[PDB]
Every structure is written in C-alpha cells, then in structure tokens.
C-alpha cells in the first residue's frame, strides 16, 4: 500500500501502444521507431509518482 500500485494490467500495455501510435501520428509519416515508444514510456513514468517534490 505504498505510493506504487500492486499489479500491472495488460490494458496498461494496450494504452501505451495506442499512445505511441498517436505519437507516430504526430510525425505524420508512419515511422514507428524506438523514440516513438520511448516517449510513450516517458509520459507513463513521469505521469505517475510526480509527488517527489
């Protein structure tokens, strides 16, 4: 019952895939790359646990 949750659902992965999909849509080129999904992981690790300060 700490700041972090217990389990990770597969919908988390479904959401981050759709998120990186939209990130590729902002490139307007269908150029799904490593940074495309890396930005999707960045808004997850930064979206959560922003209560450090």
């Amino acid at each position: 019952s700490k700041f972090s949750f217990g389990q990770a659902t597969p919908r988390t992965l479904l959401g981050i895939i759709r998120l990186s999909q939209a990130l590729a849509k902002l490139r307007l080129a269908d150029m799904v790359d490593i940074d495309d999904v890396e930005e999707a992981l960045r808004l997850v690790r930064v979206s959560k646990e922003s209560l450090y300060q």
Binding site: R18, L19, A22, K25
Partner: protein, 149 residues
C-alpha cells in the same frame, strides 16, 4: 435554401416580415428567409492546408511548438499540454474486436489549475455540462414539435 441551416451557428438572415392569420385579434409573426450568410465556415468542404502545414513542418522544433501552442494562457504544466495534444490526436481503429482511439485521462489536484484548463479543452477541441444542470434525460423524451422522438 431548405436543408441548409445547421442549429447552433452564427448566420446573417435576410427577409420580409409577415404575420400569420389566427382571443380574436392576436397576430403571430414569422420571417421568410431570403439570404443566408453563415459565419464560422465549416471545414472539410488541401492546397491552403499544406500552404501552412509544410511551413509548420519546416519551422523547426515543431513537436514542442505544437503542444506549447494548445492553450498557452497558463504558466507551466508542459507535460499537461503534452497530454492535451495526445488527447487531441486519438484516431485509431476481423472476427474479433476493433480498437478504440480514445483517451481518458483523469485529473486530480487543487485549485488553481480549476476550470481554467477545463473550459479551455472544449475551446481548443464541445458541450460543457455540470452535475445538477443535466437530469437523467439530459445527458442521454419529449413531445414532438411541428415537423414521440
């Protein structure tokens, strides 16, 4: 000119003013339309599009400028604008299920963030509703007008 006036718009209507014949001498009026000039021209009706899109692409640092451009009237909240840009994207879709290209991000926290961004979302993107202002029939049956719906 029939079937040409969407509800909830801004339009210049011209006409002639005539009453209608029916306590004994009560005249109910109306207007006969003569010309339609609609403000707020409807989209989707590519040249002028790429005239600014190609310049937007070649502008340099486009990705930060796009999310920076949606509702710049607040200070800070850069990642929040990133989430608003990604909510504005959406757009995704055999013998199974399709995929919904919709994003549902909730917001928790208080207080100076509070409606300033909330009304702004429907500004950039929108019907603003509250709790009691919509009843059980509001967000989801009436007597049919002139034209059991």
């Amino acid at each position: 000119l029939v079937r040409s006036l969407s509800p909830g718009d801004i339009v210049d209507v011209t006409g002639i003013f005539l009453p209608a014949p029916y306590a004994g001498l009560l005249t109910e009026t109306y207007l006969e339309a003569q010309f339609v000039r609609q403000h707020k021209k409807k989209f989707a009706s590519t040249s002028d599009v790429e005239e600014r899109v190609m310049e937007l692409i070649t502008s340099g640092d486009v990705y930060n400028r796009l999310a920076k451009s949606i509702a710049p009237e607040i200070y800070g909240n850069l990642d929040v604008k990133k989430a608003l840009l990604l909510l504005l994207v959406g757009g995704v879709d055999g013998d199974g299920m399709k995929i919904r290209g919709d994003i549902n991000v909730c917001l928790m926290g208080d207080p100076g963030v509070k409606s300033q961004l909330l009304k702004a979302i429907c500004k950039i993107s929108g019907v603003y509703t509250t709790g009691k202002g919509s009843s059980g029939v509001g967000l989801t049956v009436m007597k049919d007008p002139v034209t059991m719906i």
